[PDB]
Amino acid sequence: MTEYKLVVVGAGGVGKSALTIQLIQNHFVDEYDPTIEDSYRKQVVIDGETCLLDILDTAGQEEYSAMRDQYMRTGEGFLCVFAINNTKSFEDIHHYREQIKRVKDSEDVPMVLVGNKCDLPSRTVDTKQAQDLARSYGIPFIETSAKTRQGVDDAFYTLVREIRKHKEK
Ligand SMILES: C#Cc1c(F)ccc2cc(O)cc(-c3ncc4c(N5C[C@H]6CC[C@@H](C5)N6C(=O)[C@@H]5OC(=O)C5(C)C)nc(OC[C@@]56CCCN5C[C@H](F)C6)nc4c3F)c12
Ligand SMILES: Nc1nc2c(ncn2[C@@H]2O[C@H](COP(=O)(O)OP(=O)(O)O)[C@@H](O)[C@H]2O)c(=O)[nH]1
Ligand SMILES: [Mg+2]
Incomplete structure (x- = not known):
């Protein structure tokens, strides 16, 4: 069985x-310890293929050891997440993209x-800004709500489809 990290x-x-x-349990959790980094498995069928998705939810004090580089x-x-109501989180996307490429x-x-x-009304990052940043990276852009589940399966399944495309190159 194929596993995707x-x-x-x-x-x-x-x-x-x-x-x-929301992906693993189909529930919205209002409070999840901000400091905790952990991983979860979910078995799903995507485009007819039975997948094991191993999701690593990053967290913790900012550190850059050789062991963390090997873990990442x-x-x-990678899902590069920002929040539509937080301009600084959108501005930080370059940093996360560059650490992945590094x-x-x-x-x-x-x-x-x-x-x-x-789902929030206070949008400070318009869709156009994010669509432009994603087109500049050659990657897909998806809007999600972990509260309502809007776009959640689409974000993770689209990343599996990008991994499949990459393996075919
Ligand atoms: C990811 C990642 C990553 C990759 F994607 C690929 C390779 C990596 C290879 C590496 O070795 C390391 C990392 C890595 N690990 C942790 C990171 C991290 N954390 C982790 C999370 C997110 C913010 C805060 C601190 N967090 C927390 O969970 C904190 O724990 C809490 O509780 C919070 C207070 C919520 N922060 C940042 O950058 C934060 C900024 C803002 C301040 C300066 N810094 C520089 C820019 F400006 C942006 N960068 C990080 C980073 F690159 C790698
Ligand atoms: N309204 C709403 N709140 C969310 C959503 N996702 C996360 N939150 C809230 O934002 C805060 C931080 O979420 P969390 O999952 O801990 O962020 P992390 O630090 O990136 O792991 C918590 O109070 C969550 O309930 C969402 O899509 N909509
Ligand atoms: Mg967290």
């Missing part, structure tokens, strides 16, 4: 843990840009 990255408070728990290098695909040593790593919290 997915890693969820992005600034604190964007909803990385809430997205992960295990990822096959440890993978490649200009072609499967990634999806995720604009989370789309």
Whole structure:
């Protein structure tokens, strides 16, 4: 059975843990310990293929050891998450994209840009800004809400499809 190692990255408070728990448990968790980094498995069928998705929900004090670089290098695909109500989280996307490219040593790593919290009315990052950033990286952009589940399956399944495309190159 094919396993896909997915890693969820992005600034604190964007909803990385809430997205992960909405995917694995179909529930919205209002409080998930901000400091805790952990991984979960979900078996799903995507385009007819039975998948094992191993999701790593990143967290913890900012550190850059050789061991952390090797841990992040295990990822096959990355969800780069910002929150639509937080301009700084969107501005930080470049940093996360560059750390992925740094440890993978490649200009072609499967990634999806995720604009989370789309259920909130206070949007400070318009869709056009994020669509432009994603087109500049050659990756898909998807808006999600971990609260309502809008776009959640689409974000993770689109990242699996990017990994499949990459393996065919
Ligand atoms: C990811 C990642 C990553 C990759 F995607 C690929 C290879 C990596 C290889 C590496 O070795 C390391 C990392 C890595 N690990 C942690 C990171 C991290 N955390 C983790 C999360 C998110 C913010 C805060 C601190 N968090 C928390 O969970 C905190 O724990 C809490 O509780 C919070 C207070 C919520 N912060 C940042 O950057 C934050 C900024 C803002 C301040 C300066 N810094 C520089 C820019 F400006 C942006 N970068 C990080 C980083 F690159 C790698
Ligand atoms: N309204 C709403 N709140 C969310 C959503 N995702 C996360 N949150 C909330 O935002 C805060 C941070 O979420 P969390 O998953 O801990 O962010 P992380 O630090 O990226 O893991 C919590 O209070 C969550 O309930 C969402 O899509 N909509
Ligand atoms: Mg978290």
